[PDB]
Chains A and B, each alone.
With several copies, the nearest count.
Chain A
Amino acid sequence: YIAGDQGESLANESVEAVRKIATERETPSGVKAYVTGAAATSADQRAEGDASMKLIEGVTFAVITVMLLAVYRSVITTLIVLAMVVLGLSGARGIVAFLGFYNVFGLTTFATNMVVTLAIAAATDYAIFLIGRYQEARRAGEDRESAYYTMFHGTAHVVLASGLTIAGATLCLHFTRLPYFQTMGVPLAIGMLIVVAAALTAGPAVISVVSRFGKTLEPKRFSRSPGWHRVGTATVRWPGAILVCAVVAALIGLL
């Protein structure tokens, strides 16, 4: 029996201490010490997520980068989107760690890993909506000045509502008997709020400034989506047939 309970940081230290002496001893030839337990398995579970967290961060970006290149068809535009993502992640990582250092709320490996990925993905989606609407205004022929106002008018409230929805959903995770779920709602809810504030403040500020410096945020494809016009038309005149196909897809998952 060792100090601390399963999942607690003290147990991880206790498992480390017991295993340390077990490793640092003159075991007889053939005989080897093997420290194993439920707490030990949980203790090493925390480390794996924390250790792999660096690799998860690297892969996530690499995927987004490539995706940003294809969608916007512009290297300069891709870097602008990435810049807002880094700031969003940096704010999310800081405040969650900031409050945790003062023992405001607990943190688990599942909580920490989910805080990082969610923040990065959410931030990327918010940026696309702002820029995507902005380039849509540019294709409509609006100048760089009126496009900015139209962009913020038609996306800020939607982004605001979407962020609260994500934050609100994570808030419900707190109302759980289990500790891991209960201790994960608060970190996620706070983390999402930072991104929404950052996306609605740093986002428009960057878009306002960068557009003034040459042809940077202006689109380049200037091409429609032939598929969408066909998809929408079918739903307008024959919604039942389209709905049945949607219903069929849901039933497939039920199998």
Chain B
Amino acid sequence: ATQEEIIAGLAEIIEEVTGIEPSEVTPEKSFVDDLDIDSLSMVEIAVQTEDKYGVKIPDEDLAGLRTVGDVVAYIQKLEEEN
């Protein structure tokens, strides 16, 4: 879908995992220090995304992804990969 829509779903998921506001989460923000999100927390985000939006992100790709936009771009790439 649209980049903004993917963020909206992901930002909602991020709020459930940790508590970061959906408005606070922007594609520029990174899980390293901008979001202060550990790898384990990111793993749970993928699990929730897989069981809600059907987007499967393997842990190998989880390490590669750095910022929210990077995650969205990969996820939007999966949308392209029909």
Q: Does a CB–CB distance below 8 Å link A and B in the complex?
A: yes
Q: What is the interface of chain A, defined by CB distance below 8 A to chain B?
A: 229-230, 233-234, 236-237
| Interface size of B in residues (CB-CB distance below 8 Å) | 7
Q: Is the CB–CB distance between A237 and B17 below 8 Å?
A: no
Ordered nearest first, which 4 A-B pairs have the shortest CB separation?
Answer: A233-B44, A230-B40, A236-B47, A233-B43
The A contact surface, by secondary structure, is helix
Q: Is the CB–CB distance between B17 and A229 below 8 Å?
A: yes
New A-B pairs, 11, CB < 8 Å, besides A230-B40, A237-B43, A237-B59: A229-B17, A229-B41, A229-B44, A233-B40, A233-B43, A233-B44, A233-B47, A234-B40, A236-B44, A236-B47, A237-B47
CB distance from B56 to the nearest CB of A (A): 11
Contacts of A229 in B (CB 8 A): 17, 41, 44
Bits for B25-47, please: 1 = Cβ < 8 Å to A, else 0: 00000000000000011011001
CB distance from A239 to the nearest CB of B (A): 12
Contacts of A234 in B (CB 8 A): 40
Q: List 14 A-B contacts (CB under 8 A).
A: A229-B17, A229-B41, A229-B44, A230-B40, A233-B40, A233-B43, A233-B44, A233-B47, A234-B40, A236-B44, A236-B47, A237-B43, A237-B47, A237-B59
Closest to A234 in B: B40
Contacts of A236 in B (CB 8 A): 44, 47
Contacts of B47 in A (CB 8 A): 233, 236-237
CB distance from B49 to the nearest CB of A (A): 13
Contacts of B59 in A (CB 8 A): 237
CB distance from B13 to the nearest CB of A (A): 13
Closest to B44 in A: A233
CB distance from B62 to the nearest CB of A (A): 10
Contacts of A230 in B (CB 8 A): 40
